[PDB]
């Protein structure tokens with residue numbers, strides 16, 4: 001069902017949360033080789049999560065589930081804010097800018113944390 005597809009998307013989101021926090025620790029410890037590999041893993045995970053979310057929104061649309069479509073539209077916009085900050089973080093890392101990297105890292109945390117309020121409401125609506 002769309003509901004079980006959302007639970008799979010939720011798990012993939014949780015995987016990125018896990019990899020993010022082991023990356024933040026690696027960044028703080030100065031282990032740039034690790035950070036590079038975690039950033040590649042996160043990019044893949046975010047690409048997969050976006051693809052599961054789009055397929056869930058398209059299916060809720062075909063199903064006429066208006067409340068779910070509203071919530072998923074609001075979520076996909078916030079998800080894009082996260083994506084943009086993530087990509088900026090990656091570029092900060094490429095450029096050797098630890099100041100901006102720290103900034104984007106803290107911002108992505110606040111975007112992702114705020115997002116979970118909606119993420120939890122979508123589960124209950126599908």
Ligand SMILES: CCc1ccc(S(N)(=O)=O)cc1
Pocket residue numbers: 013046078079080081082083086111112113114115116119
């Ligand atoms: C694209 C980054 C991202 C990943 C996950 C979320 S959330 N916590 O599911 O709203 C928000 C933003």
